[PDB]
């Protein structure tokens, strides 16, 4: 506090004098460049240290209220670029005479610094920083910061090349933007809203950290009302406003809790909720963009918490928020499909996050009834990929998770059932009838998240319907993909083994068809990906085959059809047989793979495969085959096996002759 | 030559107890005679340790349990240990460390239950492995006859080992 | 497996037939064998297979025909050449066999003309021959070199082959066979002329097949030929023009690759002919170069390898010419300078190195002609961009920044200004490289090693203050980044824990060590600054927080442990040695490192008979000084250095001259006191081990200063016997101790000195009977044999005085200390023989899996029995006095050393003894004798070396006065039974002053402190003793006062007076009179150390009255 005030009050009085000499020298000035370079970079350095020992006292006002400084901040801002990145962390004063100056002598810097290049990129706090750190490492600090690059290396270490240099220009340039003025928040917004770029991560961290750290019930509302009115009425494109919504929410959903003014003005933004303008494309974009934005931030404003501290319902906020998703009966046209349905979903899916905190049984259900959409499906039903991929652009899984959460958190405390329809009709559950549509797949993923903790005999017939739809539909997602088959079919199998008592009311009544065709299918395919990818494929279906075997519809006719492969120069015998061993595992070796149901000597054709090949599949198939045929034939009628004993005998002979050893 | 294994406790146990249950006479004193008929053959040290485990066991198996005043049963479970899971490496060093824990758990199990109840002290050294990632009235009856037959083997065994 | 079977089917079946039965075979014996990955398993399978395979095909088609055999042999040779590169080496005799087979196979192909299998075959055979560069044989090289030269000097074969000729001819020419290398090299002229004069007129356009070979040849043989002047520029240069077209055909880029590679490995006279083309072909040469550099080729690095090389020629002739030969140079490199600026527009990427390396080559020399801060100042600014921006996640491989830094080094090989601004920048660039040194490959690791020695060389030549601050901060970064510790054996882990407890620390030292002893010379002043700078910095390093950290957390984390009940035990423990935790894990993390390497740094660097007097005289003083706050490893760096200094003669001779520059030796003497005391008093057995390495060694060095004084080595060796063999650490340091001093003026004193000596010696021989362990013992044996004179009458009085035949067996075995009644027959239970054995079981620590558990659990149980059959009127009853005491002593000490290994086990053993110390208070005397008497000798254990047994003990007492105060049974029992209260304090005060005051003092104080919370509250009994509290100080104060032999005692005693503060709550009012009289009577009897206490009492008691 002594030598600190020493070094500064003089540093203002000389900061007046023999500094600006060098500066204007440089800006005006082969000898000329060396003089410019030494003089400036020196004075830069000095200003660095000088503002650093400015900040541990009555600065800020001592910063921005005395004299001869801003100019110096800005001049070397208007000569070069590289030996300028380090004199750039410092600054950020407030009040007039300055605000203008910064935005001016600044935007122009980003110009000579910030292109729209393609994606590449790679009191409180201060008292935490002084009173928290120790001495042993501190002395690394004090000997690191005075001049030299341990100044700024210490607080960093612990297309390609130049896009990287630009990249660090953003590093300093938004890095220090984490902890300061408001316009300093504003430009970042602009920049995030061009396209996408491994700037992403740095922006997320930056913005998140802004909301957490600032906290000041003043600065807080400033950044909020601020980027809001940066979404105020003004001529900007489309991305800039959606990206304005994404990096605004991520400005808010991880922020200080005193919502005050944003939530206040929320009176006005509710008042802008309603409109119309058809069309001239323009207010089309601005409608399905403005109109779909505020609802978006609004709804996880009601994310969590101070909701029950608002005790409200805005009485009428339900009205439009529930109206519009249910609606747009209108046919497509006007390019109002995938650029308005996409954010027409947010109204509903996210508005629910204003139902859960107003949810106490029937009215919630009716927020989840009755149908009419198919908001975001059909749109993306002609697109999308996997579960997560089904999730984001759709942004319907991503809500219906927490939805099923608070909905089971409100399904269990009243009671619990073990009957299927008496839970369907009362609660949302009534939607679990499947349908003929394209939005079956999403609804199916929502079930992928119910079954985790929902079940059991409840959603019953749908499981089997979801065995019926994957034919056309599963084939319709191209084929599925590896993880595609697994998630869809593997889960329906998953839930189905997940029970005993109730797959018997689908094992005595319903299995007869649904199962039969399903297993038929499952086998026929499962050989394919395995004779393409890896072994476990068969098993990934086989085992469930076994879980199912306790009934079925005897589809072994085709199981030996598939065995009865071609001849050598194709390892398809295997493809056919491993199934057959799978078969043999159980059930009177499944009626003895129908060996006398379709034809009469298919069995004989099995023998007829092994003898031809020593192959690692035909032997073991034959092995266990003769096994349970022999154990059953020592405990069942012998005439059945005897012919086989004769056939294998024939084989053994042929193998001794045809080749000695192997 | 097999009555002492090179290492595997399970061969040795199953062999020893094939020597012990029927071949060794049901009489106390007659077993005392069968002893030196069987000792000299090893021509190999620590026999008498084997002596003790055969005899202390035989004379202690069930006059001693309920008339007091574990290493053979954890022995048979340590013969079903090597017949299943776990082979070599420091995993077997957690099985020898858990063998330390249980070999202490024989006559300690009483005293530690005395401290509190049946499940206390059980993990012992493995409790640190788990941690990283009726008290007075309880002490009083163990010191009486609560399970002093559990004191018999830890005697014998602690003597057998060195 | 199936490979042996199949090959034994269709090879011998191939002996009588062929066709399909070959190819299938060869695909079979191929594919399975192919997938062979790891060695051992896959290797051992594949060895037999490949062997029978090589030979089999050899004599197979060798003894067959054509028809289709040729096709099978063809295929096998293909699959084999792809089997060799994979199956590393290990196929040498097999290899030479395969190669002569390959030429035999082309030979059989000589009879038949035209066709295509000749080409498949021929090429494949060739590639088998090519991938043979293991060599190192003898005739294996000439056997093929001669005959390929033979078949090449004559054959008019077309083209579909000629690559092989020059391929081989270079391949063998790169080995060595002398007169072959000659005859070949001369004979090449022919081929060169054929193909080059061919490429001028016979064919309008270049031909790839024979260029392939030709350029391979002239590339491969000329490194051995040398003196190239004429043929290279034409040939090479042309090939560059020829790839400066390209269309679609593959291998096009490799045509370009073979020559430029040629030129780089010819950088001598050839590159001179290119020097001449720095004007007409100044654009041409580097335009074929750089234009290649941009092409997306597998030989991008052809661009550098030619570039970097011909830049070696630039700086070369550029410097070995005159001034006339300068400007035409500056032209080229200023085009590079433009590659430095315009990369702002277009990222040269790989070429950004070029220009750095560019502003390297000529800037090593053309700099000299003209001022050039332009270059280098720009480069400099650039390297500060590329490193400070490493605040980007660009994995700008830290092998890149010493390409840049290498270049920065010769860029920096010149300086002459000093304009501030360069100071900070160059400085950080140094530190970055000095920090980029762990992360490398080992190869590039040596590259950057070489970098740092260079760039430092320049800085040393230049500015005379900076380099120092370099070494300090750069050492700081290393030693702080140390975290975590790379030392996670027992004893060493123990010292490092006794310090502090919880990119390798180790790695960096290779760089530092290897830097100071790399290229010799100039390493001088360099390495000196390096040393002392590293020091003074560390000196203040631990001096930061560590110093505080010990005495801090030892009273901090102990406070978080501290509660109303535990604070007493903690006071007890403050007497053995501290809590060992540390507060300030920063200084406490890096400084361990600092010593810890600092051995591995200082041991191998500047150690010459000129550095090693200044080393001692200087380095001694401030170190030991800085230890005067007490810390093992801190001491561990002192003797390592002190005895490693090869001055056992100047230091010894000097010291003798002082007894019959000296000030350092006055310190030499000075440390001995505080030193030995530190061992005995505070040093916990593991940390005791630590300090003792370090107190062994200094003496070991000052031999003549180890004149008399046996208390050192006795504790030394005596630990260094059966305790430290577990790692030859403590043991080792001792042989040399005796040997060196065994004839270092220790001759006058022997009969009195060497009984102590054999006295220890016995537990390194005579235990180790009960740097390999046995070898330690052997060195013992040698060590003793050399003597002969008095190895005997020593270990006599030794073994006898130690007795070791202490046979307790309780009242000489009357009957059975603890019968039993189980079998109800031949009970044998007795146990009198079953005690001193269990004693040795708590001492065992050997088979802690079997021994500790059932041995201890057993002893416990046996304890239970003896506890019980002690109630009737048999021998047991009045039998408790021998029985019970004699085991009882070893019961708490069981709970303590059980602490180390028993854990949950020791846990229950503790309260077990504690219930056993409450019992005979809540019952009767006779058994009171026991615990109170032995433990009454446990705070005699503390004044022994014994340590934690004392804390355990205090924890016993504190509960036994609790069991008296609980055992009311009418205060009629209070007076009638005489075990506690009055009887206590008698035993206690008398305990305070028995032995004058020495190894008994640290007992009384512990007691009072351990009981204090109870002395606080219990009625008028709080009265009389408070007066006797005044004798206590009077006791203990004077007690240690006169015989103040360092603290440990001096402190806990004062703490007992900080229990005398409790009285001061105005009571009974005779205190105001008598109790106030005493402090008055204390000035005239001020007893040397009561001073601070006396006066205190005066003001304090006149205070409230």
JSON list of N, CA, C and O in Angstrom, two decimals, chain A residues 96-115:
[
{"chain": "A", "resi": 96, "resn": "UNK", "atom": "N", "xyz": [-18.30, 8.21, -19.81]},
{"chain": "A", "resi": 96, "resn": "UNK", "atom": "CA", "xyz": [-18.09, 8.75, -21.15]},
{"chain": "A", "resi": 96, "resn": "UNK", "atom": "C", "xyz": [-16.62, 9.12, -21.37]},
{"chain": "A", "resi": 96, "resn": "UNK", "atom": "O", "xyz": [-15.70, 8.69, -20.66]},
{"chain": "A", "resi": 97, "resn": "UNK", "atom": "N", "xyz": [-16.38, 9.88, -22.45]},
{"chain": "A", "resi": 97, "resn": "UNK", "atom": "CA", "xyz": [-15.04, 10.29, -22.84]},
{"chain": "A", "resi": 97, "resn": "UNK", "atom": "C", "xyz": [-14.21, 9.07, -23.22]},
{"chain": "A", "resi": 97, "resn": "UNK", "atom": "O", "xyz": [-13.19, 9.17, -23.91]},
{"chain": "A", "resi": 98, "resn": "UNK", "atom": "N", "xyz": [-14.62, 7.90, -22.70]},
{"chain": "A", "resi": 98, "resn": "UNK", "atom": "CA", "xyz": [-13.96, 6.62, -22.89]},
{"chain": "A", "resi": 98, "resn": "UNK", "atom": "C", "xyz": [-14.81, 5.64, -23.70]},
{"chain": "A", "resi": 98, "resn": "UNK", "atom": "O", "xyz": [-14.31, 5.07, -24.67]},
{"chain": "A", "resi": 99, "resn": "UNK", "atom": "N", "xyz": [-16.06, 5.38, -23.30]},
{"chain": "A", "resi": 99, "resn": "UNK", "atom": "CA", "xyz": [-16.92, 4.38, -23.96]},
{"chain": "A", "resi": 99, "resn": "UNK", "atom": "C", "xyz": [-16.86, 4.50, -25.48]},
{"chain": "A", "resi": 99, "resn": "UNK", "atom": "O", "xyz": [-16.60, 3.53, -26.22]},
{"chain": "A", "resi": 100, "resn": "UNK", "atom": "N", "xyz": [-17.14, 5.70, -25.97]},
{"chain": "A", "resi": 100, "resn": "UNK", "atom": "CA", "xyz": [-17.02, 6.01, -27.38]},
{"chain": "A", "resi": 100, "resn": "UNK", "atom": "C", "xyz": [-15.67, 5.55, -27.88]},
{"chain": "A", "resi": 100, "resn": "UNK", "atom": "O", "xyz": [-15.56, 4.74, -28.81]},
{"chain": "A", "resi": 101, "resn": "UNK", "atom": "N", "xyz": [-14.63, 6.05, -27.23]},
{"chain": "A", "resi": 101, "resn": "UNK", "atom": "CA", "xyz": [-13.26, 5.80, -27.64]},
{"chain": "A", "resi": 101, "resn": "UNK", "atom": "C", "xyz": [-12.99, 4.31, -27.82]},
{"chain": "A", "resi": 101, "resn": "UNK", "atom": "O", "xyz": [-12.53, 3.88, -28.88]},
{"chain": "A", "resi": 102, "resn": "UNK", "atom": "N", "xyz": [-13.30, 3.49, -26.81]},
{"chain": "A", "resi": 102, "resn": "UNK", "atom": "CA", "xyz": [-13.05, 2.05, -26.90]},
{"chain": "A", "resi": 102, "resn": "UNK", "atom": "C", "xyz": [-13.74, 1.48, -28.13]},
{"chain": "A", "resi": 102, "resn": "UNK", "atom": "O", "xyz": [-13.05, 0.95, -29.00]},
{"chain": "A", "resi": 103, "resn": "UNK", "atom": "N", "xyz": [-15.07, 1.62, -28.22]},
{"chain": "A", "resi": 103, "resn": "UNK", "atom": "CA", "xyz": [-15.74, 0.97, -29.35]},
{"chain": "A", "resi": 103, "resn": "UNK", "atom": "C", "xyz": [-15.09, 1.38, -30.67]},
{"chain": "A", "resi": 103, "resn": "UNK", "atom": "O", "xyz": [-14.76, 0.52, -31.50]},
{"chain": "A", "resi": 104, "resn": "UNK", "atom": "N", "xyz": [-14.83, 2.68, -30.83]},
{"chain": "A", "resi": 104, "resn": "UNK", "atom": "CA", "xyz": [-14.11, 3.17, -32.00]},
{"chain": "A", "resi": 104, "resn": "UNK", "atom": "C", "xyz": [-12.76, 2.49, -32.16]},
{"chain": "A", "resi": 104, "resn": "UNK", "atom": "O", "xyz": [-12.65, 1.48, -32.86]},
{"chain": "A", "resi": 105, "resn": "UNK", "atom": "N", "xyz": [-11.74, 2.99, -31.46]},
{"chain": "A", "resi": 105, "resn": "UNK", "atom": "CA", "xyz": [-10.38, 2.50, -31.62]},
{"chain": "A", "resi": 105, "resn": "UNK", "atom": "C", "xyz": [-10.29, 1.00, -31.39]},
{"chain": "A", "resi": 105, "resn": "UNK", "atom": "O", "xyz": [-9.19, 0.46, -31.26]},
{"chain": "A", "resi": 106, "resn": "UNK", "atom": "N", "xyz": [-11.42, 0.29, -31.42]},
{"chain": "A", "resi": 106, "resn": "UNK", "atom": "CA", "xyz": [-11.47, -1.14, -31.14]},
{"chain": "A", "resi": 106, "resn": "UNK", "atom": "C", "xyz": [-12.02, -1.95, -32.31]},
{"chain": "A", "resi": 106, "resn": "UNK", "atom": "O", "xyz": [-11.31, -2.85, -32.81]},
{"chain": "A", "resi": 107, "resn": "UNK", "atom": "N", "xyz": [-13.28, -1.73, -32.70]},
{"chain": "A", "resi": 107, "resn": "UNK", "atom": "CA", "xyz": [-13.88, -2.55, -33.74]},
{"chain": "A", "resi": 107, "resn": "UNK", "atom": "C", "xyz": [-12.88, -2.70, -34.85]},
{"chain": "A", "resi": 107, "resn": "UNK", "atom": "O", "xyz": [-12.57, -3.81, -35.30]},
{"chain": "A", "resi": 108, "resn": "UNK", "atom": "N", "xyz": [-12.32, -1.55, -35.22]},
{"chain": "A", "resi": 108, "resn": "UNK", "atom": "CA", "xyz": [-11.29, -1.43, -36.24]},
{"chain": "A", "resi": 108, "resn": "UNK", "atom": "C", "xyz": [-10.09, -2.30, -35.96]},
{"chain": "A", "resi": 108, "resn": "UNK", "atom": "O", "xyz": [-9.38, -2.69, -36.90]},
{"chain": "A", "resi": 109, "resn": "UNK", "atom": "N", "xyz": [-9.82, -2.59, -34.69]},
{"chain": "A", "resi": 109, "resn": "UNK", "atom": "CA", "xyz": [-8.76, -3.53, -34.40]},
{"chain": "A", "resi": 109, "resn": "UNK", "atom": "C", "xyz": [-9.18, -4.92, -34.81]},
{"chain": "A", "resi": 109, "resn": "UNK", "atom": "O", "xyz": [-8.43, -5.63, -35.48]},
{"chain": "A", "resi": 110, "resn": "UNK", "atom": "N", "xyz": [-10.36, -5.35, -34.36]},
{"chain": "A", "resi": 110, "resn": "UNK", "atom": "CA", "xyz": [-10.78, -6.69, -34.74]},
{"chain": "A", "resi": 110, "resn": "UNK", "atom": "C", "xyz": [-10.71, -6.84, -36.25]},
{"chain": "A", "resi": 110, "resn": "UNK", "atom": "O", "xyz": [-10.32, -7.89, -36.75]},
{"chain": "A", "resi": 111, "resn": "UNK", "atom": "N", "xyz": [-11.06, -5.78, -36.99]},
{"chain": "A", "resi": 111, "resn": "UNK", "atom": "CA", "xyz": [-10.91, -5.81, -38.45]},
{"chain": "A", "resi": 111, "resn": "UNK", "atom": "C", "xyz": [-9.54, -6.31, -38.89]},
{"chain": "A", "resi": 111, "resn": "UNK", "atom": "O", "xyz": [-9.44, -7.30, -39.63]},
{"chain": "A", "resi": 112, "resn": "UNK", "atom": "N", "xyz": [-8.46, -5.58, -38.49]},
{"chain": "A", "resi": 112, "resn": "UNK", "atom": "CA", "xyz": [-7.11, -5.96, -38.82]},
{"chain": "A", "resi": 112, "resn": "UNK", "atom": "C", "xyz": [-6.60, -7.18, -38.04]},
{"chain": "A", "resi": 112, "resn": "UNK", "atom": "O", "xyz": [-5.42, -7.58, -38.03]},
{"chain": "A", "resi": 113, "resn": "UNK", "atom": "N", "xyz": [-7.56, -7.75, -37.33]},
{"chain": "A", "resi": 113, "resn": "UNK", "atom": "CA", "xyz": [-7.28, -8.88, -36.44]},
{"chain": "A", "resi": 113, "resn": "UNK", "atom": "C", "xyz": [-8.23, -10.05, -36.57]},
{"chain": "A", "resi": 113, "resn": "UNK", "atom": "O", "xyz": [-7.77, -11.19, -36.46]},
{"chain": "A", "resi": 114, "resn": "UNK", "atom": "N", "xyz": [-9.48, -9.82, -36.91]},
{"chain": "A", "resi": 114, "resn": "UNK", "atom": "CA", "xyz": [-10.56, -10.81, -36.83]},
{"chain": "A", "resi": 114, "resn": "UNK", "atom": "C", "xyz": [-11.28, -10.95, -38.16]},
{"chain": "A", "resi": 114, "resn": "UNK", "atom": "O", "xyz": [-12.23, -10.22, -38.46]},
{"chain": "A", "resi": 115, "resn": "UNK", "atom": "N", "xyz": [-10.89, -11.93, -38.97]},
{"chain": "A", "resi": 115, "resn": "UNK", "atom": "CA", "xyz": [-11.64, -12.28, -40.18]},
{"chain": "A", "resi": 115, "resn": "UNK", "atom": "C", "xyz": [-12.78, -13.26, -39.91]},
{"chain": "A", "resi": 115, "resn": "UNK", "atom": "O", "xyz": [-12.84, -13.93, -38.89]}
]
